[PDB]
Amino acid sequence: YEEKVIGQAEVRQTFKVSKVGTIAGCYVTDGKITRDSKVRLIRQGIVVYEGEIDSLKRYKDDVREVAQGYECGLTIKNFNDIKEGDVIEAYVMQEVARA
């Protein structure tokens, strides 16, 4: 088996607040945008940033994933670029959410 997409989404926005962090929201279009997953966004030319998720917290609670088509606010590792930069892409193995 290959480590295909496990959480592809599109940045909604981010939270570069002087109280929170950089809670980057993303609309999902593939697997799940979970805490136990990596991340890889891209602009209209190249990669905007890469790594993993820092935290996972929606507008309701601290959800672990965001599959189907739900948007949740999550930080993306040590994100240098902020505010709805572009489309994000979570990639990993088949051990997400439950592992």
UniProtKB/Swiss-Prot annotation:
Subcellular localization, as worded in the UniProt entry: Cytoplasm
Coiled-coil spans in chain: none
Lineage top rank: taxon: Bacteria
General function of this protein: One of the essential components for the initiation of protein synthesis. Protects formylmethionyl-tRNA from spontaneous hydrolysis and promotes its binding to the 30S ribosomal subunits. Also involved in the hydrolysis of GTP during the formation of the 70S ribosomal complex.
Recorded family membership: Belongs to the TRAFAC class translation factor GTPase superfamily. Classic translation factor GTPase family. IF-2 subfamily.
The name this protein goes by in its record: Translation initiation factor IF-2
Organism annotation: Geobacillus stearothermophilus
Residues of the full protein shown: 643 to 741 of 741
